[PDB]
Design a protein around this ligand. Structure first.
Ligand SMILES: *C(=O)[C@@H](NC(=O)[C@H](N)c1ccccc1)[C@@H]1N[C@@H](C(=O)O)C(C)(C)S1
Ligand SMILES: *C(=O)[C@@H](NC(=O)[C@H](N)c1ccccc1)[C@@H]1N[C@@H](C(=O)O)C(C)(C)S1
Lengths: 453, 453
């Protein structure tokens, strides 16, 4: 086998690598180093979700966002509640929801007599996985994969930090966002400036308290944040849209937990599963992965879906196909949880199942391609021949973690599946951009060795 | 050296162990397996904090909780504001605060004419470490180590779920706590129950919503909750205590966020450092660790202390004594953060520092003693001869993590220091009772080899 031990000499001191690789044609393991150690898979976890979704949802699967009502239309009035049904569409734009509501106009509803009711019942319990880190929850990459999801459940604020030390930075929220940003951030001089933290503390109803400081900067810029209460956000946006459409409403917003009985007025459908999976796999969209993860449970068990139900469903589905998990922990579909524990060999068995069943699953085309697209279009260790345009791989990255899982063609045109998990990688401290050079060098050498072996 | 690698065969598949030990009398390393690999130390991290606290705070250090004003007292009136200064005391009880406020009434004050002003300026930025897991933040073990801390910033509620399927569980909060617990949790039948989640959602101002369902219970279901807004909680306690003391107050509660000057009326002192360190080390008190961590930085740098300053101070203080951290990540004093990264050998160098300076530090007596006290009085791997009454060790545990760091006497009467980090330990799914038999056997074997080597 490849001497993976010698290769990890170039990784930073303290790090730990789990590396396993198999020549599928020869049915031979050609690298095996901590292949059985549980590690943090980060976003390589999305491979499991991709397979489960293919199998339990199918290529015709679409997320539906619907408008329903129990009552009768007449005189331009909807004589009852407007029910808005959200099922976790992670790719729903504000533009789409608007056209959806526009459908009420087209049917001559001039005004709604009753209350606005949101049906988010297909998801159950929290909209965050267990073991997610609290301070990342305001970052847009970590926006909640909730039933209601509008423009990725992210917003930005406009900041102007062009000021002398001690002065207050100006923060405005653009008029489209029903959010508050409150508190005060000051400009720090270049001394204290390397120390700066911007603190964001969440309060109810999408009110974000900022504190701390920032280094002077000349030009305005935007900071993005995740929406926290996605039901209030969604309801506030629908009410503004109804006004814009000139449909009249003066009811309250209700948020029941149970499916809402009704007559269907209109429906919007997302792109189907193959397009969602491709964006999830190429760009590594956390929210698509966690929505599919629970959509899989919802459809598979026919009951409202918690992340725990997602875990049960994904394992049960892949187990049906011969995959064995032992005591792996799969707390989410995106890989964000710090409780996830998976060994390289388990990820590898899934990659083999993917390559074996490619005629059916067509998942190979979803993987980023070295030097070409997705999250590895510029990956340093992969950017030269013989690896460029040859290595395809799902990436996973968290603080301390640099992973790759996928396939390549060796110098004999045989296929090699491989999993690389690197954890404990640290070359400065909390809030030091990480020196990636030893990683570029490890990966360049590793994939060349698997190429020639 | 000891063949640690064979001994890990008894640990669950997937787990990883970092073990290192030294015979101090011979100065020989006798076990060294993954000794340089960064791992999660969990509460063994508190060893670093004990040493930094001894060096920078000293045995006379006590936390101060104080009452100040600028008005003068005339004719039974405090003619200005009551300032209550909190500095992070992690062992302040509401009875102690009550006796402190009683002192006003011994100085003749029976009415306060102004406002209640809290000064919590000694600590700054969040009261939570970065990399803490969001869903544990409502649990009493994860109560915020804030400036204001009353009864461990934890309270108790009871759910009476001894009722039929379909009924709403009754929530009872004892009346001493100025908090609200509300929601509709229902009792689920035997069929639905395995799918239930009992959730809590935190709302502004210490309002807790419980949601979900649970199986019929056949005793009272206790909830133990962390206080989320510690300033509001403290101000509410103060106002009820003032009332109960017959001191009239009708002013506002102000939280200015900067140091508040005034004349000192009365000062409550905690128990001194050696008592705080003994409780932190014997029992593993998370709040005393994170309190001391930031008190250390406040006193060492003389400026409001965040967790980042805590990290800088602890490293700087120990670096002076010859400890080298390289690229370790210490995000807190308690080890709760999932970003913490430290190698067995760095912890061992601190243990050696501890044994070498025992005549001045007196920290040896703060470690738990196998089969005798603290968190290893009943630790199954250590409770037989020759380990019982001989091994002393600080424990660390999180989901997946089972650590010891401490000392023992071997068969020759020489002192051995050791560090055992186990991560990736999984014997079932997330919410499962973990199986400890593999841990008991691995530890019984490892400490026996270290005894015999
Ligand atoms: C999977 O690993 C995901 N990672 C994250 O969301 C991290 N929390 C993160 C790391 C760095 C920057 C922003 C978020 C997604 N996958 C990553 C990857 O494929 O390498 C990502 C950085 C593109 S986000
Ligand atoms: C340090 O390791 C601390 N651990 C925790 O607070 C964990 N979050 C936890 C694990 C299990 C149950 C409750 C909390 C403290 N140290 C532990 C130890 O010494 O083993 C602890 C369980 C006593 S709490």
């Amino acid at each position: 086998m490849i001497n993976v031990s010698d290769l990890t000499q170039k990784l930073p001191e303290g790090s730990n690598a789990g590396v396993i690789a198999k020549n599928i044609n020869q049915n031979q393991i050609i690298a095996d180093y901590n292949g059985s150690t549980f590690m943090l898979p980060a976003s390589t976890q999305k491979v499991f979700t991709a397979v489960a979704a293919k199998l339990a949802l199918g290529d015709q699967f679409q997320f539906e966002t619907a408008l329903l009502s129990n009552g009768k239309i007449q005189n331009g009035n909807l004589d009852g509640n407007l029910i808005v049904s959200f099922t976790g569409d992670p790719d729903l734009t504000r533009g789409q929801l608007y056209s959806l509501l526009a459908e009420l106009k087209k049917q001559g509803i001039k005004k709604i007599n009753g209350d606005l009711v949101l049906d988010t019942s297909v998801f159950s319990s929290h909209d965050r996985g267990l073991g997610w880190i609290w301070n990342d929850l305001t970052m847009c990459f970590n926006s909640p994969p909730a039933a209601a999801n509008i423009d990725n459940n992210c917003f930005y604020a406009e900041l102007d930090a062009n000021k002398n030390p001690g002065e207050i930075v100006k923060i405005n929220v653009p008029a489209q966002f029903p959010i508050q940003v409150f508190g005060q951030v000051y400009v720090a001089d270049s001394n204290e400036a390397p120390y700066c933290q911007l603190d964001v503390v969440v309060h109810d109803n999408n009110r974000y308290q900022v504190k701390g400081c920032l280094a002077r900067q000349y030009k305005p810029f935007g900071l993005s944040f995740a929406v926290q209460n996605t039901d209030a956000y969604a309801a506030a946006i629908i009410q503004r849209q109804l006004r814009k459409l000139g449909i009249e409403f003066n009811g309250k917003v209700l948020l029941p937990q149970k499916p809402q009985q009704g007559q269907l007025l209109a429906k919007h459908l997302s792109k189907p599963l193959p397009d969602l999976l491709k964006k999830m796999m190429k760009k590594s969209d956390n929210q698509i992965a966690d929505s599919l993860f629970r959509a899989v449970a919802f459809n598979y068990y026919k009951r409202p879906a918690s992340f725990q139900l997602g875990t049960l469903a994904v394992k049960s589905i892949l187990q049906k196909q011969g995959i064995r998990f032992g005591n792996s922990i799969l707390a989410d579909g995106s890989g964000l949880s710090r409780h996830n524990l998976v060994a390289p060999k388990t990820m590898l068995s899934v990659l083999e199942y993917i390559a074996k069943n490619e005629d059916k699953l067509h998942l190979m085309e979803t993987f980023p391609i070295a030097g070409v697209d997705g999250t590895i279009s510029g990956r340093g260790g992969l950017i030269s021949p013989p690896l460029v345009k040859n290595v395809i791989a799902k990436t996973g990255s968290l603080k301390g973690v640099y992973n790759l899982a996928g396939f390549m063609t060796n110098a004999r045109g045989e296929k090699v599946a491989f999993v690389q998990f690197i954890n404990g990688y640290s070359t400065g401290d909390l809030e030091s951009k990480t020196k990636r050079a030893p990683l570029v060098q490890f990966e360049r050498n590793l994939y060349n060795e698997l190429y020639k072996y």
